[PDB]
Protein backbone atom coordinates (compact mmCIF):
# COMPACT_ATOMS: atom_id res chain seq x y z
CA UNK A 563 0.00 0.00 0.00
CA UNK A 564 0.85 3.71 -0.25
CA UNK A 565 -0.28 7.17 0.96
CA UNK A 566 -0.50 8.49 -2.62
CA UNK A 567 -2.40 11.69 -3.09
CA UNK A 568 -3.92 14.20 -5.41
CA UNK A 569 -4.66 17.73 -4.44
CA UNK A 570 -7.45 19.26 -6.44
CA UNK A 571 -8.65 22.77 -5.48
CA UNK A 572 -6.74 22.42 -2.20
CA UNK A 573 -8.62 19.30 -1.04
CA UNK A 574 -6.68 16.05 -0.59
CA UNK A 575 -7.75 12.69 -2.05
CA UNK A 576 -6.13 9.35 -1.20
CA UNK A 577 -5.87 6.97 -4.17
CA UNK A 578 -7.36 3.50 -3.79
CA UNK A 579 -6.58 2.32 -7.33
CA UNK A 580 -6.21 3.33 -10.97
CA UNK A 581 -9.02 2.26 -13.37
CA UNK A 582 -8.48 4.17 -16.71
CA UNK A 583 -5.32 4.70 -18.84
CA UNK A 584 -3.98 5.69 -22.26
CA UNK A 585 -4.31 9.11 -23.73
CA UNK A 586 -2.31 11.33 -21.44
CA UNK A 587 -5.01 10.64 -18.92
CA UNK A 588 -5.73 8.40 -16.02
CA UNK A 589 -8.78 7.74 -13.94
CA UNK A 590 -8.39 6.96 -10.21
CA UNK A 591 -10.70 5.61 -7.57
CA UNK A 592 -10.29 7.86 -4.63
CA UNK A 593 -11.17 8.74 -1.04
CA UNK A 594 -11.78 12.29 0.15
CA UNK A 595 -11.16 13.72 3.64
CA UNK A 596 -14.64 12.55 4.84
CA UNK A 597 -13.68 9.00 3.66
CA UNK A 598 -16.28 9.41 0.84
CA UNK A 599 -15.56 7.68 -2.48
CA UNK A 600 -15.05 9.50 -5.83
CA UNK A 601 -13.34 9.22 -9.21
CA UNK A 602 -10.64 11.57 -10.49
CA UNK A 603 -9.79 11.92 -14.14
CA UNK A 604 -6.35 13.45 -14.67
CA UNK A 605 -5.04 14.79 -18.01
CA UNK A 606 -1.45 15.89 -18.72
CA UNK A 607 -1.31 18.81 -21.17
CA UNK A 608 2.40 19.32 -22.18
CA UNK A 609 1.54 17.04 -25.11
CA UNK A 610 -1.68 18.61 -26.45
CA UNK A 611 -2.22 20.94 -29.41
CA UNK A 612 -4.72 23.83 -29.31
CA UNK A 613 -7.42 21.61 -30.85
CA UNK A 614 -7.09 18.84 -28.23
CA UNK A 615 -6.90 21.66 -25.63
CA UNK A 616 -10.03 23.44 -26.91
CA UNK A 617 -11.88 20.08 -26.89
CA UNK A 618 -11.01 19.28 -23.26
CA UNK A 619 -12.15 22.77 -22.32
CA UNK A 620 -15.36 22.11 -24.23
CA UNK A 621 -16.03 18.72 -22.57
CA UNK A 622 -15.65 20.45 -19.13
CA UNK A 623 -17.99 23.33 -20.01
CA UNK A 624 -20.62 20.88 -21.29
CA UNK A 625 -20.26 18.52 -18.31
CA UNK A 626 -20.80 21.66 -16.28
CA UNK A 627 -23.84 23.04 -18.14
CA UNK A 628 -25.66 19.69 -18.51
CA UNK A 629 -25.38 18.71 -14.81
CA UNK A 630 -28.21 21.09 -13.96
CA UNK A 631 -30.44 19.58 -16.66
CA UNK A 632 -30.08 15.83 -15.91
CA UNK A 633 -29.04 13.25 -13.31
CA UNK A 634 -28.15 10.86 -16.20
CA UNK A 635 -25.08 12.85 -17.13
CA UNK A 636 -22.15 11.83 -14.93
CA UNK A 637 -21.78 14.36 -12.10
CA UNK A 638 -18.73 16.65 -12.02
CA UNK A 639 -18.23 18.02 -8.52
CA UNK A 640 -15.04 19.99 -8.94
CA UNK A 641 -12.25 20.59 -11.37
CA UNK A 642 -8.87 22.28 -11.57
CA UNK A 643 -7.41 23.36 -14.90
CA UNK A 644 -3.95 24.78 -15.49
CA UNK A 645 -1.61 25.21 -18.48
CA UNK A 646 -0.02 21.77 -17.68
CA UNK A 647 -2.93 19.63 -16.37
CA UNK A 648 -6.61 19.03 -15.77
CA UNK A 649 -8.04 17.27 -12.69
CA UNK A 650 -11.77 16.43 -12.59
CA UNK A 651 -13.54 14.97 -9.53
CA UNK A 652 -16.62 13.01 -10.51
CA UNK A 653 -19.10 10.61 -9.00
CA UNK A 654 -17.84 7.09 -8.98
CA UNK A 655 -19.14 4.10 -10.84
CA UNK A 656 -19.59 0.45 -10.02
CA UNK A 657 -19.04 -0.72 -13.55
CA UNK A 658 -19.46 0.38 -17.12
CA UNK A 659 -22.27 -0.95 -19.24
CA UNK A 660 -19.87 -2.63 -21.74
CA UNK A 661 -18.18 -4.88 -19.18
CA UNK A 662 -21.59 -5.40 -17.47
CA UNK A 663 -23.30 -6.67 -20.64
CA UNK A 664 -20.70 -9.39 -21.19
CA UNK A 665 -20.90 -10.85 -17.63
CA UNK A 666 -24.66 -10.42 -16.99
CA UNK A 667 -26.33 -13.84 -17.39
CA UNK A 668 -29.63 -13.02 -19.16
CA UNK A 669 -31.22 -9.60 -18.43
CA UNK A 670 -34.41 -8.71 -16.48
CA UNK A 671 -36.96 -7.07 -18.83
CA UNK A 672 -37.93 -4.41 -16.22
CA UNK A 673 -34.17 -3.68 -15.76
CA UNK A 674 -33.55 -3.26 -19.54
CA UNK A 675 -36.52 -0.93 -19.93
CA UNK A 676 -35.14 1.23 -17.13
CA UNK A 677 -31.65 1.28 -18.66
CA UNK A 678 -33.20 2.17 -22.02
CA UNK A 679 -35.09 5.10 -20.43
CA UNK A 680 -31.91 6.31 -18.74
CA UNK A 681 -30.06 6.25 -22.04
CA UNK A 682 -32.86 8.08 -23.87
CA UNK A 683 -33.01 10.85 -21.26
CA UNK A 684 -29.24 11.44 -21.30
CA UNK A 685 -28.95 11.56 -25.10
CA UNK A 686 -32.14 13.68 -25.27
CA UNK A 687 -30.49 16.17 -22.89
CA UNK A 688 -27.27 16.47 -24.89
CA UNK A 689 -29.38 16.81 -28.05
CA UNK A 690 -31.17 19.76 -26.50
CA UNK A 691 -27.85 21.57 -26.15
CA UNK A 692 -26.79 20.76 -29.75
CA UNK A 693 -24.44 17.91 -28.96
CA UNK A 694 -24.73 14.96 -31.35
CA UNK A 695 -22.34 12.35 -29.85
CA UNK A 696 -22.17 10.18 -33.05
CA UNK A 697 -19.88 7.51 -31.44
CA UNK A 698 -22.29 6.01 -28.84
CA UNK A 699 -21.64 2.55 -27.40
CA UNK A 700 -22.06 0.77 -23.98
CA UNK A 701 -18.69 2.04 -22.67
CA UNK A 702 -20.08 5.63 -22.80
CA UNK A 703 -22.53 4.67 -20.05
CA UNK A 704 -21.83 4.02 -16.38
CA UNK A 705 -23.98 2.13 -13.84
CA UNK A 706 -24.24 4.19 -10.60
CA UNK A 707 -26.68 2.65 -8.11
CA UNK A 708 -28.68 0.91 -10.83
CA UNK A 709 -28.90 3.90 -13.12
CA UNK A 710 -27.13 4.46 -16.42
CA UNK A 711 -25.17 7.73 -16.69
CA UNK A 712 -23.61 9.29 -19.74
CA UNK A 713 -19.88 9.96 -19.23
CA UNK A 714 -18.55 11.02 -22.67
CA UNK A 715 -20.02 13.35 -25.40
CA UNK A 716 -18.09 12.21 -28.50
CA UNK A 717 -16.34 15.57 -28.19
CA UNK A 718 -12.56 15.17 -27.38
CA UNK A 719 -10.15 12.75 -29.19
CA UNK A 720 -9.33 -1.91 -30.92
CA UNK A 721 -12.77 -0.32 -30.40
CA UNK A 722 -15.97 -2.22 -31.16
CA UNK A 723 -17.34 -0.93 -34.55
CA UNK A 724 -20.56 -2.66 -33.61
CA UNK A 725 -22.78 0.38 -32.79
CA UNK A 726 -21.85 2.58 -35.75
CA UNK A 727 -24.58 4.30 -37.82
CA UNK A 728 -24.74 4.05 -41.68
CA UNK A 729 -24.40 7.77 -42.35
CA UNK A 730 -21.10 7.93 -40.37
CA UNK A 731 -19.84 5.68 -43.13
CA UNK A 732 -20.58 7.95 -46.14
CA UNK A 733 -18.16 10.88 -45.91
CA UNK A 734 -15.55 8.09 -46.05
CA UNK A 735 -23.75 18.50 -39.00
CA UNK A 736 -24.58 18.37 -42.77
CA UNK A 737 -24.22 14.51 -42.86
CA UNK A 738 -24.70 13.41 -39.18
CA UNK A 739 -27.98 14.24 -37.40
CA UNK A 740 -29.46 13.33 -34.00
CA UNK A 741 -30.82 10.28 -35.79
CA UNK A 742 -27.25 8.90 -35.78
CA UNK A 743 -27.47 8.49 -31.99
CA UNK A 744 -30.84 6.65 -32.33
CA UNK A 745 -29.22 3.91 -34.41
CA UNK A 746 -26.48 3.43 -31.78
CA UNK A 747 -28.92 3.41 -28.89
CA UNK A 748 -30.86 0.93 -31.08
CA UNK A 749 -27.85 -1.41 -31.21
CA UNK A 750 -27.32 -1.16 -27.46
CA UNK A 751 -30.97 -2.14 -26.92
CA UNK A 752 -30.54 -4.79 -29.62
CA UNK A 753 -27.70 -6.30 -27.55
CA UNK A 754 -29.83 -6.26 -24.40
CA UNK A 755 -32.78 -8.06 -26.09
CA UNK A 756 -31.19 -10.66 -28.39
CA UNK A 757 -27.91 -11.21 -26.45
CA UNK A 758 -25.70 -9.67 -29.22
CA UNK A 759 -25.50 -6.70 -31.69
CA UNK A 760 -27.01 -6.93 -35.23
CA UNK A 761 -23.63 -7.64 -36.92
CA UNK A 762 -21.65 -9.23 -34.06
CA UNK A 763 -21.32 -12.53 -35.95
CA UNK A 764 -20.20 -10.72 -39.17
CA UNK A 765 -16.66 -11.47 -40.24
CA UNK A 766 -13.74 -9.04 -41.16
CA UNK A 767 -14.57 -5.58 -39.68
CA UNK A 768 -14.68 -4.18 -43.25
CA UNK A 769 -17.26 -6.92 -43.99
CA UNK A 770 -19.49 -5.49 -41.20
CA UNK A 771 -19.33 -1.95 -42.67
CA UNK A 772 -20.81 -3.35 -45.89
CA UNK A 773 -23.79 -4.87 -44.02
CA UNK A 774 -24.39 -1.68 -41.98
CA UNK A 775 -24.71 0.37 -45.18
CA UNK A 776 -26.29 -2.41 -47.32
CA UNK A 777 -30.07 -1.72 -47.57
CA UNK A 778 -30.83 -5.23 -48.93
CA UNK A 779 -29.08 -6.74 -45.86
CA UNK A 780 -31.96 -7.49 -43.46
CA UNK A 781 -31.53 -7.34 -39.67
CA UNK A 782 -33.45 -10.14 -37.95
CA UNK A 783 -36.01 -9.38 -35.25
CA UNK A 784 -37.09 -12.68 -33.62
CA UNK A 785 -40.51 -12.68 -31.95
CA UNK A 786 -39.75 -11.93 -28.31
CA UNK A 787 -42.70 -11.56 -25.86
CA UNK A 788 -42.49 -7.74 -25.58
CA UNK A 789 -44.15 -6.62 -28.82
CA UNK A 790 -43.49 -2.94 -28.12
CA UNK A 791 -39.76 -3.55 -27.53
CA UNK A 792 -39.61 -5.37 -30.87
CA UNK A 793 -41.03 -2.30 -32.68
CA UNK A 794 -38.64 0.11 -30.92
CA UNK A 795 -35.70 -1.87 -32.32
CA UNK A 796 -37.06 -1.92 -35.88
CA UNK A 797 -37.69 1.86 -35.78
CA UNK A 798 -34.25 2.59 -34.32
CA UNK A 799 -32.41 0.41 -36.82
CA UNK A 800 -33.80 1.92 -40.04
CA UNK A 801 -30.96 2.81 -42.42
CA UNK A 802 -32.50 6.00 -43.83
CA UNK A 803 -32.33 8.61 -41.02
CA UNK A 804 -35.37 10.34 -42.54
CA UNK A 805 -37.46 7.23 -41.73
CA UNK A 806 -35.58 6.36 -38.52
CA UNK A 807 -37.47 7.27 -35.31
CA UNK A 808 -36.63 10.44 -33.34
CA UNK A 809 -35.74 10.63 -29.63
CA UNK A 810 -38.88 12.59 -28.82
CA UNK A 811 -40.88 9.92 -30.63
CA UNK A 812 -39.05 7.21 -28.65
CA UNK A 813 -40.03 8.89 -25.32
CA UNK A 814 -43.69 8.70 -26.37
CA UNK A 815 -43.46 5.09 -27.61
CA UNK A 816 -45.52 2.50 -25.65
CA UNK A 817 -42.39 0.52 -24.69
CA UNK A 818 -41.22 3.36 -22.39
CA UNK A 819 -44.76 4.60 -21.57
CA UNK A 820 -46.99 1.53 -20.75
CA UNK A 821 -46.02 -1.19 -18.18
Ligand SMILES: Cc1cc(-c2ccc3nc(Nc4ccc(C(=O)N5CCOCC5)cc4)nn3c2)cc(C)c1O
Pocket residue numbers: 581582589601603636652653654655656657658661704713714
Ligand atom coordinates in the same frame (compact mmCIF):
# COMPACT_ATOMS: atom_id res chain seq x y z
C1 LIG B 1 -12.58 9.06 -19.23
C2 LIG B 1 -13.73 9.48 -18.32
C3 LIG B 1 -14.07 8.67 -17.23
C4 LIG B 1 -15.12 9.01 -16.36
C5 LIG B 1 -15.46 8.19 -15.26
C6 LIG B 1 -16.13 8.71 -14.13
C7 LIG B 1 -16.47 7.89 -13.05
C8 LIG B 1 -16.15 6.53 -13.07
N1 LIG B 1 -16.33 5.52 -12.22
C9 LIG B 1 -15.79 4.45 -12.81
N2 LIG B 1 -15.78 3.21 -12.26
C10 LIG B 1 -15.50 2.07 -12.94
C11 LIG B 1 -14.83 1.03 -12.27
C12 LIG B 1 -14.53 -0.17 -12.92
C13 LIG B 1 -14.90 -0.35 -14.26
C14 LIG B 1 -14.59 -1.65 -15.02
O1 LIG B 1 -15.51 -2.41 -15.31
N3 LIG B 1 -13.33 -1.94 -15.40
C15 LIG B 1 -13.06 -3.20 -16.16
C16 LIG B 1 -11.75 -3.14 -16.97
O2 LIG B 1 -11.41 -1.78 -17.31
C17 LIG B 1 -11.07 -1.03 -16.12
C18 LIG B 1 -12.20 -1.02 -15.07
C19 LIG B 1 -15.57 0.67 -14.93
C20 LIG B 1 -15.87 1.87 -14.28
N4 LIG B 1 -15.29 4.80 -14.00
N5 LIG B 1 -15.48 6.00 -14.19
C21 LIG B 1 -15.15 6.83 -15.28
C22 LIG B 1 -15.83 10.20 -16.62
C23 LIG B 1 -15.50 11.02 -17.71
C24 LIG B 1 -16.28 12.31 -17.97
C25 LIG B 1 -14.45 10.66 -18.56
O3 LIG B 1 -14.13 11.47 -19.61
